[PDB]
Structures are given as structure tokens and as C-alpha cells.
Design an enzyme around this catalytic site. Structure first.
Site, PDB file in Angstrom:
ATOM      1  N   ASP A 132       0.931  -0.959  -0.225  1.00  0.00           N
ATOM      2  CA  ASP A 132      -0.361   0.150  -0.096  1.00  0.00           C
ATOM      3  C   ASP A 132       0.891   1.867  -0.123  1.00  0.00           C
ATOM      4  O   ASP A 132       0.913   2.616   0.964  1.00  0.00           O
ATOM      5  CB  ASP A 132      -1.115  -0.031   0.901  1.00  0.00           C
ATOM      6  CG  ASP A 132      -2.423   0.812   1.171  1.00  0.00           C
ATOM      7  OD1 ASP A 132      -2.182   1.433   0.160  1.00  0.00           O
ATOM      8  OD2 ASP A 132      -2.911   1.032   1.753  1.00  0.00           O
ATOM      9  N   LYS A 134       2.149   4.308  -1.060  1.00  0.00           N
ATOM     10  CA  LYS A 134       1.795   6.336  -1.386  1.00  0.00           C
ATOM     11  C   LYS A 134       2.174   7.165  -0.529  1.00  0.00           C
ATOM     12  O   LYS A 134       2.523   7.077   0.586  1.00  0.00           O
ATOM     13  CB  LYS A 134      -0.024   5.558  -1.370  1.00  0.00           C
ATOM     14  CG  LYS A 134      -0.093   5.455  -0.061  1.00  0.00           C
ATOM     15  CD  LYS A 134      -2.123   5.535  -0.189  1.00  0.00           C
ATOM     16  CE  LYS A 134      -1.669   4.549   1.429  1.00  0.00           C
ATOM     17  NZ  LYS A 134      -3.970   4.995   0.998  1.00  0.00           N
ATOM     18  N   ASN A 137       1.942   6.935   2.729  1.00  0.00           N
ATOM     19  CA  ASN A 137       2.153   6.709   3.903  1.00  0.00           C
ATOM     20  C   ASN A 137       3.873   6.752   3.495  1.00  0.00           C
ATOM     21  O   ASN A 137       4.836   6.439   4.809  1.00  0.00           O
ATOM     22  CB  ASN A 137       2.179   4.743   3.596  1.00  0.00           C
ATOM     23  CG  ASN A 137       0.814   4.339   3.443  1.00  0.00           C
ATOM     24  OD1 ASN A 137       0.389   4.722   4.272  1.00  0.00           O
ATOM     25  ND2 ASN A 137       0.624   3.305   2.427  1.00  0.00           N
ATOM     26  N   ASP A 150       2.916   2.449   8.010  1.00  0.00           N
ATOM     27  CA  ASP A 150       1.917   2.030   7.445  1.00  0.00           C
ATOM     28  C   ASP A 150       1.805   0.370   7.003  1.00  0.00           C
ATOM     29  O   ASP A 150       1.728   0.361   5.965  1.00  0.00           O
ATOM     30  CB  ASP A 150       0.740   2.833   6.764  1.00  0.00           C
ATOM     31  CG  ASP A 150      -0.486   2.819   6.834  1.00  0.00           C
ATOM     32  OD1 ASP A 150      -1.213   2.950   7.720  1.00  0.00           O
ATOM     33  OD2 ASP A 150      -1.274   1.202   5.768  1.00  0.00           O
ATOM     34  N   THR A 162      -4.959   0.781  -2.373  1.00  0.00           N
ATOM     35  CA  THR A 162      -5.479   2.601  -2.592  1.00  0.00           C
ATOM     36  C   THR A 162      -5.117   2.542  -4.493  1.00  0.00           C
ATOM     37  O   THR A 162      -4.537   1.788  -4.986  1.00  0.00           O
ATOM     38  CB  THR A 162      -4.695   3.616  -2.140  1.00  0.00           C
ATOM     39  OG1 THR A 162      -4.766   3.222  -0.939  1.00  0.00           O
ATOM     40  CG2 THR A 162      -5.664   4.517  -3.050  1.00  0.00           C
TER      41      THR A 162
HETATM   42  C1  LIG Z   1       0.153  11.005  10.532  1.00  0.00           C
HETATM   43  C2  LIG Z   1       1.565  11.728  11.037  1.00  0.00           C
HETATM   44  C3  LIG Z   1       2.233  10.581  11.525  1.00  0.00           C
HETATM   45  C4  LIG Z   1       2.066   9.610  11.892  1.00  0.00           C
HETATM   46  C5  LIG Z   1       1.381   8.181  10.841  1.00  0.00           C
HETATM   47  C6  LIG Z   1       1.318   6.931  11.140  1.00  0.00           C
HETATM   48  O1  LIG Z   1       0.751   6.331  10.166  1.00  0.00           O
HETATM   49  C7  LIG Z   1       2.314   6.293  11.744  1.00  0.00           C
HETATM   50  C8  LIG Z   1       2.740   6.565  12.372  1.00  0.00           C
HETATM   51  C9  LIG Z   1       3.982   8.111  12.478  1.00  0.00           C
HETATM   52  N1  LIG Z   1       3.588   9.351  12.722  1.00  0.00           N
HETATM   53  C10 LIG Z   1       3.627  10.494  12.530  1.00  0.00           C
HETATM   54  O2  LIG Z   1       4.370  11.814  12.691  1.00  0.00           O
HETATM   55  C11 LIG Z   1       2.183  12.786  11.183  1.00  0.00           C
HETATM   56  C12 LIG Z   1       1.095  13.526  11.431  1.00  0.00           C
HETATM   57  C13 LIG Z   1       1.954  15.053  11.017  1.00  0.00           C
HETATM   58  C14 LIG Z   1       3.066  14.681  11.601  1.00  0.00           C
HETATM   59  N2  LIG Z   1       2.810  12.881  11.828  1.00  0.00           N
END
Ligand SMILES: CC(C1=c2cc(O)ccc2=NC1=O)c1ccc[nH]1
Length: 276
Positions: A132, A134, A137, A150, A162
Site C-alpha cells: 500500500d 503511496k 504513507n 503503515d 489504494t
Molecule cells: C500522521 C503523522 C504521523 C504518523 C502516522 C502513522 O500512520 C504512523 C506514524 C506516524 N508518525 C507521525 O508523525 C503525522 C502527521 C503530522 C505529523 N506526523
């Protein structure tokens, strides 16, 4: 190290929201570290028959030990919830910057394509298929290096990823392989340069048609050597995709002219080109 509890954290904003999970920013109180904590509701995991997927996610991540991947520091649970303590990449998803800067210049495209390729080489070295891949991710850390995340839907050597990114063999055979990730890589490069994924249409079904037909186009403002690499990735026959083992692996891929000026050994020690 004693098992951690939710009380050990000051939880903050929601970083991300999946179908089966939410990711929340948490500052650990004793150390002041921030983590991205993925929270899964057990009951829900169970009623949706996702236990194997959560198990598979935890197992893969524990095996991964490479700067281009989100790391798993810890897990614990209370009576209702699983918690996975994960790397917090401060700059969020790659998709953001694509939407923000519109489309990458040649230097930035080459840099981030190369980091993604290096991550795939490692992952595929461990016999793991992401399935997946993309921009959503693919995350960016404080220094703007990627961290791929992910892994619930990875396979270690059924599932469909996706729509814009699924490979033809998914739509005709229903059995993927390392090569399916390379197809997704083709799509991501194209999107890096074009600003948009190559296959797209009113709905999922039209999307799938364009894919199995290989119905897509290159803008004229498209880096030629980048164009030539994309075409050697977006190939209906999975055994003919650059980087796949039937094409003798990542050597030919990394030796592609588009990557002519890339030092593959220490990409993550290198300083990424500003994104504008
Ligand atoms: C969405 C996001 C982050 C993640 C998303 C995941 O599925 C797994 C680990 C992770 N670490 C992040 O920092 C994020 C958004 C803004 C900053 N970090």
C-alpha cells in the site's frame, strides 16, 4: 524496561485517522519525548477480523531497522485499547508537500525518489512487501528525510491497496509480489513530477479500467529521463519491471540514468534540497 501506561503520557492532537486506528501525538512525561502513538480499539479489531493484520503490523515493524522507516519504540494495552509507540515525523505526509508546492523540480524528485528506492531495497531485502505504498504513507521527519509507515497490510515472504496505486496483477490475478511495490513507485514518481497520479477517473471502477489498459499520459513538462524510468516501472507484465528480481534486482534500477548523480550509500546523511 518496565511496561509503559497511558498515564505516562500527555496526549495531544490527532495526527492521523485510519479505518481501524487513530494516531495521536503524545509527550512522554518522564523524558519529555514526543511519540506518534497509534491506538487500536480491540473490540473493533476483533469484530472486523483484523487481528492478523495488527499482529502482522507489529511483527514487521519490530523487524525493521533502517532510518527510512517509522520505528516502533514500544507497545502496551489497557482493557479496551492497543497502543503502539511510533516515530513522530514532524513534517507529516509527503502528499502535503506535493499539494503544497504543486510538483517537484528535478533535483527534489531525484532525491526523494532515490530515498524511496533505497527503502524498498531494504524492505524487499527482508522479504517484505508493503502493498500500500503511496504519498500518504511516506512521511517526512524534522530534517525532511522520508519515513515510510503503515505496515498492517504488508505481506512477508488477499489484500488490495489504494485504487490509484494498485498494480494490474492485483486486478487480474489477485496475487501481488515485490513487483507491485515497484508499480506503486512508478505512480509516485509520476505524481512527484506531474503533481497528480497517472491513473485517475470519476470512480474506482473507471480507475481500474485505465490501469489494466495502461491508459495514461505524460505532460510535456516532464523530465525525460524521469519519463523513461516511469515507463520501465509502469509495465503490465510484473516480470518486466525494473528492480524486480526477474530483471536482476535493484542494481539495474539504481543504475538508471535518472539517478546518474546519486550517491546511494548515505542518502540519509545527505542534506535534502529545499522543497519549492
Ligand atoms: C500522521 C503523522 C504521523 C504518523 C502516522 C502513522 O500512520 C504512523 C506514524 C506516524 N508518525 C507521525 O508523525 C503525522 C502527521 C503530522 C505529523 N506526523
Amino acid at each position: 524496561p518496565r511496561k509503559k501506561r497511558p498515564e505516562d503520557f500527555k496526549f495531544g492532537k490527532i495526527l492521523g485517522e485510519g479505518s481501524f486506528s487513530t494516531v495521536v501525538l503524545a509527550r512522554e512525561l518522564a523524558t519529555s519525548r514526543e511519540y506518534a502513538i497509534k491506538i487500536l480499539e480491540k473490540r473493533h479489531i476483533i469484530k472486523e477480523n483484523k487481528v492478523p493484520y495488527v499482529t502482522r503490523e507489529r511483527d514487521v515493524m519490530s523487524r525493521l531497522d533502517h532510518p527510512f522507516f517509522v520505528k516502533l519504540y514500544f507497545t502496551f494495552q489497557d482493557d479496551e485499547k492497543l497502543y503502539f509507540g511510533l516515530s513522530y515525523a514532524k513534517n507529516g505526509e509527503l502528499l502535503k508537500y506535493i499539494r503544497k508546492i504543486g510538483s517537484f523540480d528535478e533535483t527534489c524528485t531525484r532525491f526523494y525518489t532515490a530515498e524511496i528506492v533505497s527503502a524498498l531495497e531494504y524492505l524487499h531485502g527482508k522479504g517484505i512487501i508493503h502493498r500500500d505504498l503511496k504519498p500518504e504513507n511516506i512521511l517526512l521527519n524534522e530534517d525532511m528525510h522520508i519515513q515510510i509507515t503503515d505496515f498492517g497490510t504488508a505481506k512477508v515472504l488477499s489484500f488490495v491497496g489504494t485504487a490509484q496505486y494498485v498494480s494490474p496483477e492485483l486486478l487480474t490475478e489477485k496475487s501481488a509480489c515485490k513487483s507491485s511495490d515497484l508499480w506503486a513507485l512508478g505512480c509516485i514518481i509520476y505524481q512527484l513530477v506531474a503533481g497528480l497520479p497517472p491513473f485517475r477517473a470519476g470512480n474506482e471502477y473507471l480507475i481500474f479500467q485505465k490501469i489494466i489498459k495502461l491508459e495514461y499520459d505524460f505532460p510535456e513538462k516532464f523530465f525525460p529521463k524521469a519519463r523513461d524510468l516511469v515507463e520501465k516501472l509502469l509495465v503490465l507484465d510484473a516480470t518486466k519491471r525494473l528492480g524486480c528480481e526477474e530483471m536482476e534486482g535493484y542494481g539495474p534500477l539504481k543504475a538508471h540514468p535518472f539517478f546518474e548523480s546519486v550517491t546511494w550509500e548515505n542518502l540519509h546523511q545527505q542534506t535534502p534540497p529545499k522543497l519549492t
